[PDB]
């Protein structure tokens, strides 16, 4: 089966698109080489369309069958409930794409009569019709990157396929509670989205330590969503149905599976029939949970097929890391090849072939890696980081083009103890907020593929809660980390770290002169910048702050909102 068919109608924008970073003193302060920073647009949609369109064949075996059986058994211990309409509405992000039926996110969150009455109608149609395909819109994503000639110019736009707002709210009623319980039940600690960055680091360290002679790899499936088959998706439903659920939930879930998840017609922004999908929809509630579960099933089965010795896995959607016992250099190369062939048979062929790695810092999971620095008192402290190129390119763009969802606040929160967040992103954005005079204002941002709302003035307590007090005191970063950062700065025409330190000293002073929470931000976030450091004490506010489920509730990604 072909992942997609196409009518030939173009994929069209619903708004004007800019592809090139605008020259502006605010963004230029961050980096100068603006011609290297681009935004994907609908102009490249066809290019992506060709990539994601291909035939899928799937040959299963005893290893797959056996894993599936264990997983269904594990799922049967789950009891899940329907969400009320009001609950589902409140999880709708303030700027979710509006319904075609005369209402939008604002009306959904405020429970307007038009919105509510429509959603009830959609829910009833789900309950009474399990057959008629639900229409979806296909859009080219606008995301910002830095160019990389060494790997061939510019990425074409990613495609997003999603149904009407009314259907999306119904998805939450049927399946949200499941997203909060199911992944953990069937895969346990391997489910990555439940972890904060610190917890992810801890897990990776544990896995590494549990091997006598550790060897890790990450596995990159070539366009995962497209490799997911109709069978895969119906298998996911049978896993959902293995849970203890009310009858009404069972009905709606089956309808959504047959009418939406397994496939359906795609329309462009102009309403023209664009094509037909027979794979994973990239823009539904179950995209992330489904990918996570289906990836785990195929990966674990492939491990058994290949004879991977004592595998420990970390799965986040299509993102997959396997840590196991090395069997020797050539043996590992052999075993990884066999793993790949099994994954390929299961309909998950690789993009780039996996490589055995014997250094944990070199293992990339969700574009991130574990690194090490020194805390106060001189002890080694492990933390999550990544190449800052893309965060920086996006931070520049977002400085001059204001988006309702900003990437930079997410990066500051996730990567708080990193040297690039601390010296560059923090310095830059606190400056910008003072210039704009909007320090004390809540902002929406994406993180773990879902939406959150945070006041920048609350960052110290948030960072302490998530990362500990040492996030403000770390120094002596690894040579691998230091070189990568410096290279990224040079590549972008950004000031070197020493310049940022001077700039941070001034930002800090301005913050302090404002008193209140702002002075706290100044004293805590920028202690690294002064000659005579303050002695930092734990913030009582951090303790009164409950983020222990902050990442789990994100459900791995999507049209989901939390404060």
Swiss-Prot record:
Reactions accelerated catalytically: RNA(n) + a ribonucleoside 5'-triphosphate = RNA(n+1) + diphosphate
Membrane topology: Single-pass type IV membrane protein
PTM characteristics: The N-terminus is phosphorylated by host PRK2/PKN2.
Inhibition and activation profile: Activity is up-regulated by PRK2/PKN2-mediated phosphorylation.
Domain RdRp catalytic: 214-332
Subcellular location: Host cytoplasm; Host endoplasmic reticulum membrane
Cofactor: Mg(2+)
Residues engaged in binding Mg(2+) 2: 220, 318-319
Top-rank taxon, per record: Viruses
Cofactor note: Binds 2 magnesium ion that constitute a dinuclear catalytic metal center.
Subunit record text: Homooligomer. Interacts with non-structural protein 5A. Interacts with host VAPB. Interacts with host PRK2/PKN2. Interacts with host HNRNPA1 and SEPT6; these interactions facilitate the viral replication. Part of the replication complex composed of NS2, NS3, NS4A, NS4B, NS5A and the RNA-directed RNA polymerase embedded in an ER-derived membranous web.
Record's function text: RNA-dependent RNA polymerase that performs primer-template recognition and RNA synthesis during viral replication. Initiates RNA transcription/replication at a flavin adenine dinucleotide (FAD), resulting in a 5'- FAD cap on viral RNAs. In this way, recognition of viral 5' RNA by host pattern recognition receptors can be bypassed, thereby evading activation of antiviral pathways.
Designated name of the protein: RNA-directed RNA polymerase
Organism expressing this protein natively: Hepatitis C virus genotype 2a (isolate JFH-1)
Lineage: Viruses, Riboviria, Orthornavirae, Kitrinoviricota, Flasuviricetes
């Amino acid at each position: 089966s072909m992942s997609y068919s196409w009518t030939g109608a173009l994929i069209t924008p619903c708004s004007p698109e800019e592809e090139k970073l605008p020259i502006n003193p605010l963004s230029n302060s961050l980096l100068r080489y603006h011609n290297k920073v681009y935004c994907t647009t609908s102009k490249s949609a066809s290019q992506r369309a060709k990539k994601v369109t291909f035939d899928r064949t799937q040959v299963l075996d005893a290893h797959y069958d056996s894993v599936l059986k264990d997983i269904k058994l594990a799922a049967s211990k789950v009891s899940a409930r329907l969400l009320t309409l009001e609950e589902a509405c409140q999880l709708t992000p303030p700027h979710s794409a509006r319904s075609k039926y005369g209402f939008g996110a604002k009306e959904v969150r405020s429970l307007s009569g038009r919105a509510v009455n429509h959603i009830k109608s959609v829910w009833k149609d789900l309950l009474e019709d399990p057959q008629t395909p639900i229409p979806t819109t296909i859009m080219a994503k606008n995301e910002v990157f830095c160019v990389d000639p060494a790997k061939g110019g510019k990425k074409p736009a990613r495609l997003i396929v999603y149904p009407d707002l009314g259907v999306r709210v119904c998805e939450k009623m049927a399946l949200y509670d499941i997203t909060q319980k199911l992944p953990q039940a069937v895969m346990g600690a391997s489910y990555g989205f439940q972890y904060s960055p610190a917890q992810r680091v801890e897990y990776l360290l544990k896995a590494w330590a549990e091997k006598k002679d550790p060897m890790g790899f990450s596995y990159d499936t070539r366009c995962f969503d497209s490799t997911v088959t109709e069978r895969d998706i119906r298998t996911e439903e049978s896993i959902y149905q293995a849970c203890s659920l009310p009858e009404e939930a069972r009905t709606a879930i089956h309808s959504l599976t047959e009418r939406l998840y397994v496939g359906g017609p795609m329309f462009n922004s102009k309403g023209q029939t664009c094509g037909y999908r027979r794979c994973r929809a990239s823009g539904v509630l179950t995209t992330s949970m489904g990918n996570t579960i289906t990836c785990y099933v195929k990966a674990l089965a492939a491990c058994k097929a290949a004879g991977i010795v004592a595998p420990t896995m970390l799965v986040c959607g299509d993102d997959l890391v396997v840590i196991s016992e090395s069997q020797g250099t050539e043996e590992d190369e052999r075993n990884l090849r066999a793993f790949t062939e099994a994954m390929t048979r299961y309909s998950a062929p690789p993009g780039d072939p996996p490589r055995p790695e014997y250094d944990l810092e070199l293992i990339t999971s969700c574009s991130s890696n574990v690194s090490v620095a020194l805390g106060p008192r001189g002890r080694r402290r492990y933390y999550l980081t990544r190449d800052p190129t893309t965060p920086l390119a996006r931070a520049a763009w977002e400085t001059v083009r204001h988006s309702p969802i900003n990437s930079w606040l997410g990066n500051i929160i996730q990567y708080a103890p990193t040297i690039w967040v601390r010296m560059v992103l923090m310095t830059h954005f606190f400056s910008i907020l003072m210039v704009q005079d909007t320090l004390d204002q809540n902002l929406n941002f994406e993180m773990y593929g879902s939406v959150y709302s945070v006041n920048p003035l609350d960052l110290p307590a948030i960072i302490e809660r998530l990362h500990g007090l040492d996030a403000f005191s770390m120094h002596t970063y690894s040579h691998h980390e230091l070189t990568r950062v410096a290279s990224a700065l040079r590549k972008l025409g950004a000031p070197p770290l020493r310049v940022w330190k001077s700039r941070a000293r001034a930002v800090r002073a301005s913050l302090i002169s404002r008193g209140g929470k702002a002075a706290v931000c100044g004293r805590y976030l920028f202690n690294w910048a002064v000659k005579t450091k303050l002695k930092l004490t734990p913030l009582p506010e951090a303790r009164l702050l409950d983020l222990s489920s902050w990442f789990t509730v994100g459900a791995g990604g999507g049209d989901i909102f939390h404060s």
